[PDB]
């Protein structure tokens, strides 16, 4: 029953700016989106907005932008007297509801989504008398504010002179048309996009600049239906008309469709009724959040996908990342498997294929960021599309969870080959020393190297920034140490490839931190990163590797290999199954032999040193750069021996290391590069926390995992309030940072509800 969970997130708001941002540039209100639609709605905040759902949020290809404060807001007149209504408004999973109550007239408005482009409003009017209905709307004028305060006096029309918004009428409603705007970071339209309003009765619409007023007379009680459609191309506009007509012909079919779909999400999803009411509401919040970030096919992305946040400054539209998808799809397999499947298809739909025009050397590669608009390199004008790096190998894990739920063999058959191609890419383009253990690295890209193939880097000394190129040059510079710091685009890309941007283990340490490290008796050379080019015997530059093998990716590949073997077995490929099991076993051996340090009782990346060690390992574990969440990856993924897991868990539970106010953060308190304000050098993310708890359970420490989950529930700020889900937490204070409505936080909070709030 969706009605048991009213207002889990605050969805009220009356936007006054196209960009009505919070402190960190995210839209500061939380509109309701469903069915992968490309528009969203808010609840009225009071008398000024009652009668409508203010703040039509448009997803303009890659960004969320508000269109209007009031739009299609109802006012009711009875014999020339304006009805003064009492307002009650709330959200439930799958709907917005607004009730307007007066003596002689009552209105109940229920807003649900009907198609991937269309929301449906039921306006149920009860009256003992005929009434005159007036709907009004006005497009926004002002561009941008922060925390409700204008950032400039720019106007929408001033900033985007080609936008040239215009309202037009039809017999059953109205529409807004939009000119072509290609503002790479702000506002992207085709020139054919429209926002259409159609109703189940004729209305008389007048237009005055960027305002409208529509009228209708009714003889008494009636239920009216209204469709709202954001359509992004001429082809979408044409296709949606038949759906709109069907919706207005049989609105009950669509309302029931949405009611039933949401009853199923909650029935399948809420499988821990012994959780506390507050814990259950957190799960419901997570479900609402995940489904709201789902987007239907659009532009270059021909599948339903899920983005990190529909309200996010840089996460909105249909911008899609691989390891976000793997995590989200894993969680959503347990309540919305149809879309989990789609999301996985969306990512792999842009896997690099043989003969690729841009990077034929990268067959099997999965781009880091795909979106509506292709990059200039692929013939589009998209500024977000990114092929500098991929993300870690969690794909097979998510594919197999969708199979576990659906038991659909056709699914395994379609994904298996894409998973294999991805695996093969790692081993061709990210294994410099040919030992079957991957490195993180960087593709051949304008960001990383010259046209002729020389790696870029910048030397900084005082106020000087000296851009340079060439690996030979880089090696000479670092041996010599004549600089204050270095900026290396390939290093940044390697950290992005791990998903842990600017993490300590990849050589990221601030000047003060490094100075303290050296003062304490460490060497500056302990933090220098080395690189190698990966080149085929025929001269083709494949990319760059960090001369470092990372324990998380080794562990993820280990489990990925075992899932591949499970898929091969299901598909009657016994030899391929054997090969993946054997590859998995070798990775476990390497992880335990090379990446485990018995002295500090933890796992670490290893260097690829000039010569291998006596035990065959590429180099020693990088104990100097401190402990991080990669250290429990061998537990999560099942690579660790029991003895090694025993050791790791002791460190996890040590308040000196990871057992902080909010525990299991992204660097131990003992890590020389730790900061409680640094995203991937101390802050706690829900994915890495849950990976830790699952790792603990896998090796016999479930009871300890339950205690850490309880500590998280008590100390993570905002968890039981009605605010949107964010990205991470301060490990010392529990304070939140990051984009609101963040998908993988929602994913892993949901799985924490499922697995560890018990
Ligand atoms: O561009 C690919 C990288 O994007 C990063 O995500 C955000 C980033 O957090 C934000 O600060 C801003 O720069 O936009 C980016 C998306 O374009 C990822 O964290 C990084 O790993 C890469 O995927
Ligand atoms: Ca290697
Ligand atoms: Mg019970
Ligand atoms: Mg670009």
């Amino acid at each position: 029953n969706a009605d048991n969970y009213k207002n889990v997130i605050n969805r009220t708001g009356a936007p006054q700016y196209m960009k009505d941002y919070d402190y960190d540039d995210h839209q500061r209100f939380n509109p309701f989106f469903d069915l992968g639609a490309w528009h969203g709605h808010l609840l009225p905040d009071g008398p000024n907005t009652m009668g409508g759902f203010p703040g039509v949020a448009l997803l303009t290809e890659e960004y969320i932008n508000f269109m209007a404060s009031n739009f299609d807001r109802l006012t009711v007149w009875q014999d020339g007297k304006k009805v003064d209504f009492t307002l009650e408004a709330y959200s439930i999973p799958g709907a917005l509801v607004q009730k307007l109550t007066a003596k002689d007239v009552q209105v109940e408005m229920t807003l649900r989504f009907a198609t991937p482009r269309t929301s449906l409003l039921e306006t149920k009017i009860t009256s003992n008398k005929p009434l005159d209905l007036v709907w009004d709307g006005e497009l926004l004028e002002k561009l941008e504010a922060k925390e409700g305060k204008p950032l400039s006096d720019k106007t929408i029309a001033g900033e985007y002179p080609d936008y040239q918004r215009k309202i037009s009428a039809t017999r059953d409603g109205l529409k807004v048309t939009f000119g072509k705007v290609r503002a790479t970071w702000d506002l992207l339209t085709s020139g054919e996009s429209e926002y259409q309003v159609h109703k189940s009765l004729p209305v008389q619409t007048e237009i005055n600049g960027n305002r409208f007023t529509s009228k209708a007379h009714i003889n008494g009680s009636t239920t009216l239906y209204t469709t709202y459609s954001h359509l992004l191309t001429a082809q979408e506009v044409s296709k949606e008309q038949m759906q709109i007509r069907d919706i207005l012909a049989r609105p009950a079919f669509y309302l029931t469709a949405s009611q039933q779909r949401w009853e199923e999400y909650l029935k399948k999803g809420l499988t821990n009724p012994d959780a506390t009411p507050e814990q259950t509401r957190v799960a419901v919040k997570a479900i609402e959040t995940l489904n709201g970030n789902w987007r239907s096919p659009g532009g270059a992305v021909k599948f339903n996908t899920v983005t990190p946040s529909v309200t996010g400054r840089w996460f909105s539209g249909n911008q899609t990342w691989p390891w976000n998808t793997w995590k989200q799809a894993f969680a959503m397999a347990h309540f919305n498997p149809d879309i989990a499947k789609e999301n996985i298809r969306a990512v792999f739909s842009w896997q690099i294929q043989p003969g690729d025009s841009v990077r034929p050397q990268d067959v099997g590669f999965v781009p880091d960021l795909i979106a509506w608009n292709l990059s200039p390199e692929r013939g589009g004008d998209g500024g977000n599309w990114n092929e500098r790096n991929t993300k870690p190998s969690l794909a097979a894990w998510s594919v197999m969870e969708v199979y576990n739920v659906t038991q659909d063999k056709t699914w395994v058959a379609e994904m298996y080959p894409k998973l294999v191609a991805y695996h093969d890419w790692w081993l061709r383009n990210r294994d410099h020393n040919g030992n079957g253990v991957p490195e993180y690295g960087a593709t051949r890209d304008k960001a990383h190297n010259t046209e002729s193939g020389e790696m870029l880097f910048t030397v900084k000394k005082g106020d000087k920034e000296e851009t340079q190129s060439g690996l030979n040059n880089y090696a000479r510079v670092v041996e010599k140490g004549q600089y204050d710091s270095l900026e290396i685009p390939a290093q940044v890309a390697a950290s992005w490839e791990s998903g842990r941007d600017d993490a300590a283990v990849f050589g990221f340490i601030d000047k003060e931190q490094l100075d303290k490290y050296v003062a304490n008796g460490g060497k500056r050379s302990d933090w220098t990163v080395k690189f190698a080019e990966n080149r085929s015997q025929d001269g083709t530059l494949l990319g760059y590797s960090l001369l470092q093998e990372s324990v998380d990716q080794a562990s993820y590949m280990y489990s990925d290999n075992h899932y591949l073997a499970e898929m091969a077995t299901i598909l009657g490929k016994p030899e391929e199954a054997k090969r993946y099991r054997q590859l998995a076993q070798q990775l476990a051996d390497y992880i335990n032999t090379c990446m485990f340090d018995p002295t500090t009782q933890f796992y670490y990346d290893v260097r690829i040193e000039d010569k291998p060690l006596a035990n065959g390992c590429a180099g020693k574990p990088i104990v100097e750069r401190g402990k991080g969440p990669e250290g429990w990856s061998p537990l999560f993924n099942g690579a660790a021996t029991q003895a090694n897991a025993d050791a790791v868990v002791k460190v996890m539970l040590d308040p000196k290391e990871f057992n902080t106010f909010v525990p299991l953060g992204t660097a131990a308190l003992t890590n020389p590069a730790f900061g409680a304000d640094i995203y991937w050098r101390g802050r706690v993310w829900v994915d890495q926390f849950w990976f830790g708890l699952k790792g603990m359970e896998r090796y016999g420490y479930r009871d300890d995992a339950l205690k850490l989950a309880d500590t998280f529930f008590r100390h993570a700020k905002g968890l039981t309030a009605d605010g949107p889900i964010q990205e991470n937490y301060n490990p010392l204070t529990g304070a939140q940072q990051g984009a609101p409505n963040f998908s993988w936080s929602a994913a892993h909070l949901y799985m924490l509800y499922n697995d560890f709030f018990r």
Side-chain angles (χ1 to χ4, degrees), residues 86 116 135 138 150 173 231 326 378 444 479 535 565 667 704 758:
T86 294
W135 296 269
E138 179 177 298
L231 302 158
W326 314 142
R378 293 194 180 277
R444 197 176 75 210
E479 195 212 332
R535 194 175 291 271
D704 286 306
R758 296 199 181 244

Side-chain angles (χ1 to χ4, degrees), residues 625-682:
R625 295 188 199 156
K627 299 182 193 75
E630 67 272 26
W632 54 80
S633 290
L635 282 68
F636 171 63
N637 292 108
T641 68
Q642 188 64 56
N644 295 357
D646 288 339
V648 167
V649 172
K650 284 194 183 62
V651 172
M652 292 174 72
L653 293 175
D654 190 340
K656 191 184 163 62
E657 304 285 358
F658 290 101
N659 200 354
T660 45
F661 185 74
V662 179
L664 309 186
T666 50
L669 293 171
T670 55
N671 190 302
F674 172 97
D677 60 312
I678 305 178
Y679 266 34
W680 292 97
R681 311 214 295 270

Side-chain angles (χ1 to χ4, degrees), residues 474-489:
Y474 176 81
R476 159 172 69 264
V477 170
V478 298
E479 195 212 332
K480 199 187 181 147
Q482 304 307 328
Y483 54 86
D484 287 344
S485 67
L486 302 178
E487 280 192 315
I488 312 157

